[PDB]
C-alpha cells in the first residue's frame, strides 16, 4: 500500500562481455580496450612525411639506381617504405656486403647531406670518369650509379691513384665504393691495364684490401662480370684514403648523416593520403587512443601494444536485465 524498493539500473545497450564464470553476457555499460580499425593509408608521422621508395630497394636508393633518380634530395623524412619485392635493387649484379646492417643503420637516420666527397672534375683528372653500363638503363639509355664513378683508364694508362677525404663535416659520414671483377681477363686488360690489381680503403677504424678475381660466371642482367659493394661509417675527424691500380669504382657522392630515433622500414602497398595520424602500420594508421591494437604487429611510434585477440571489452556497468 505504501512501500520502498531497492533496485539496480538496466539500460537498452547490448554491449556483450566475457567473464571467468560464463561468457557472452550482456552488460549495462562497457568500454572497448582493443583498437580494431585502421585506414589503409600512409599518414605523416608527427608532421614529417615518410620517404616512399616505391619501385626501388634501399640498395638502389643509396647508390642512385638510375631508375631511382627522383627520390634523391628527399633528405627529410620520418620513415622509409619499401615495396615488398623491389624490382629496382642493384642495377649491377654482385654482392652487397653487410646489406642488413646498413639497412639497420639507415633506419635510425633522419637527415642526409648528399655531398660530393670526391668531385669528378678535380679528383680524378688523369683517369676516365666516363663509366657507363648497359644494365643500368634509363629512358632506354645506358646509365650508371649516380653516387659512384666507374674509373677506367685514359690515354691507355691508369696510374696509381691515392686520393683521400678528411671528415670535416662534424657528423658521421657514410662512404660507399665498389670493387670490379671483369668477365674475362681480356676485358680486365682493356679497362685497367693491369693483371695484378689491388684496392685498399684504410681509415682509423677500417682497413680491408681488395684483390679482384677474374673468372667465368653465370650471366645476370646481361653483364657477366660482377661488382661488389662495400661501405664504412667514418667517425667525425678521421680520414679515409683510397688507393688502387685497377677495378675500383670510387665514390663521388657520400652521405653525411645524423642519427635519430622513431623511423624504420615498413613494406606495404598502401597509398599516401596526407592524414597526420600519431602512429602508422603497413595497413594504415591507428586511431591511437586505446591501449591495445590488433591491426598489425609492426608499428612506427607511440602505438598501443599488439595483442592477437579478437575483442577485449571491460565491464564498467553491471548485468543488464530489463523487463
Amino acid at each position: 500500500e505504501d512501500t520502498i524498493c531497492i533496485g539496480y539500473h538496466a539500460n537498452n545497450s547490448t554491449d556483450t562481455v566475457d567473464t571467468v564464470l560464463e561468457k557472452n553476457v550482456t552488460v549495462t555499460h562497457s568500454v572497448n580496450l582493443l583498437e580494431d580499425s585502421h585506414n589503409g593509408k600512409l599518414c605523416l608521422l608527427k608532421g614529417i612525411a615518410p620517404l616512399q621508395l616505391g619501385n626501388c630497394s634501399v640498395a638502389g636508393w643509396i647508390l642512385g639506381n638510375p631508375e631511382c633518380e627522383l627520390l634523391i634530395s628527399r633528405e627529410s623524412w620520418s620513415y622509409i617504405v619499401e615495396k615488398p619485392n623491389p624490382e629496382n635493387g642493384t642495377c649491377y649484379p654482385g654482392h652487397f656486403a653487410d646489406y642488413e646492417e646498413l639497412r639497420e643503420q639507415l633506419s635510425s637516420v633522419s637527415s642526409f647531406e648528399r655531398f660530393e666527397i670526391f668531385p669528378k672534375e678535380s679528383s680524378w683528372p688523369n683517369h676516365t670518369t666516363t663509366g657507363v653500363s648497359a644494365s643500368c638503363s634509363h629512358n632506354g639509355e645506358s646509365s650508371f650509379y649516380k653516387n659512384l664513378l666507374w674509373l677506367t683508364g685514359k690515354n691507355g694508362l691508369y696510374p696509381n691513384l691515392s686520393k683521400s677525404y678528411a671528415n670535416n663535416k662534424e657528423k658521421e659520414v657514410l662512404v660507399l665504393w665498389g670493387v670490379h671483377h671483369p668477365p674475362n681477363i681480356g676485358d680486365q686488360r682493356a679497362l685497367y691495364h693491369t693483371e695484378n690489381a689491388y684496392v685498399s680503403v684504410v681509415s682509423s677504424h677500417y682497413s680491408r684490401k681488395f684483390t679482384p678475381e677474374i673468372a667465368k660466371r653465370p650471366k645476370v642482367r646481361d653483364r657477366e662480370g660482377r661488382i661488389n659493394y662495400y661501405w664504412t661509417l667514418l667517425e667525425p675527424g678521421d680520414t679515409i684514403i683510397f688507393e688502387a691500380n685497377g677495378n675500383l669504382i670510387a665514390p663521388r657522392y657520400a652521405f653525411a648523416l645524423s642519427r635519430g630515433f622513431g623511423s624504420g622500414i615498413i613494406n606495404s602497398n598502401a597509398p599516401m593520403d596526407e592524414c597526420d595520424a600519431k602512429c602508422q602500420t603497413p595497413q594504415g594508421a591507428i586511431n591511437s587512443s586505446l591501449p591495445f591494437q590488433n591491426v598489425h604487429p609492426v608499428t612506427i611510434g607511440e602505438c598501443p601494444k599488439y595483442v592477437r585477440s579478437a575483442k577485449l571489452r571491460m565491464v564498467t556497468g553491471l548485468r543488464n536485465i530489463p523487463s
Partner: protein, 216 residues
C-alpha cells in the same frame, strides 16, 4: 492495407516455354475502368525495371514476349518464350489505395542441361601473408544446378571450421551458377602444412572433383 500475396514463390521453366506468375490481392485493384497493377523485373545488382503498367499495357523497349493480364482480385503474367536473359525475380505492385504496396516476389529459374563445375584453387598472396593472416580461395565457376558441396582438407585431414561460401545467382547470358569457398587461417597455422585440397561433390560426377596445390 492491401497485401499482394504472390504465387508461386520459386519457379523454374525450361527455355522456349511459357512461365505463369499469379498475384492475388486482399482487395480489388480496379480504378475507374482499369486495374492499377504493375509488374517489375529485378536482376541481381540492378534496380527494378518496369514491365507492365495498368494491368496489361506493355511499356516500350522491352520485348513483346511479356504479357500482363487479369482483373479484380487476381492477375497473372506470361513470358513466352522464356529466354536466358529472364533469370531474375519479379514483383507485382498495386496503385489504387495509399499506401502503394508490392507483392512478396518470385524468382524465375531457367531449366537447362546439367553442367560440371570448372574448379580453380589459388594460394594466398605474398602481400596477404604480411597481414598476419592468409586465405586460400577455391573457385567453382560455371556449373548447374544449385546443389554442390565443397570440402577442405589440410594435409588430407578434412577441415570444416573457418570456411566461407557464397553463391552467385544465375548468369543473365548463361543460365549458370558459381560459388567460392575461402579458408581464413592464421599466418602461423597456414605455414604448418603443405597439402591444401578443395574437393567438390556434384551431381555431374560420381567421384568428387579435386584440384589442389603445395608450397614446395
Amino acid at each position: 492495407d492491401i497485401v499482394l500475396t504472390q504465387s508461386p514463390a520459386s519457379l523454374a521453366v525450361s527455355l522456349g516455354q511459357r512461365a505463369t506468375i499469379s498475384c492475388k490481392a486482399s482487395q480489388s485493384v480496379d480504378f475507374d475502368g482499369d486495374s492499377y497493377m504493375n509488374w517489375y523485373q529485378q536482376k541481381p545488382g540492378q534496380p527494378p525495371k518496369l514491365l507492365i503498367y495498368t494491368t496489361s499495357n506493355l511499356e516500350s523497349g522491352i520485348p513483346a514476349r511479356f504479357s500482363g493480364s487479369g482483373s479484380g482480385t487476381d492477375f497473372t503474367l506470361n513470358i513466352h518464350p522464356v529466354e536466358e536473359e529472364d533469370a531474375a525475380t519479379y514483383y507485382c505492385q498495386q496503385s489504387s489505395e495509399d499506401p502503394y504496396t508490392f507483392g512478396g516476389g518470385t524468382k524465375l529459374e531457367i531449366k537447362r542441361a546439367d553442367g560440371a563445375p570448372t574448379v580453380s584453387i589459388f594460394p594466398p598472396s605474398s602481400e596477404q601473408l604480411t597481414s598476419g593472416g592468409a586465405s586460400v580461395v577455391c573457385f567453382l565457376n560455371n556449373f548447374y544446378p544449385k546443389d554442390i558441396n565443397v570440402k577442405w582438407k589440410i594435409d588430407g585431414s578434412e577441415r570444416q571450421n573457418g570456411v566461407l561460401n557464397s553463391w552467385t545467382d544465375q548468369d543473365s547470358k548463361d543460365s549458370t551458377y558459381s560459388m567460392s569457398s575461402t579458408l581464413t587461417l592464421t599466418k602461423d597455422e597456414y605455414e604448418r602444412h603443405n597439402s591444401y585440397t578443395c574437393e567438390a561433390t556434384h551431381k555431374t560426377s560420381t567421384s568428387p572433383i579435386v584440384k589442389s596445390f603445395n608450397r614446395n
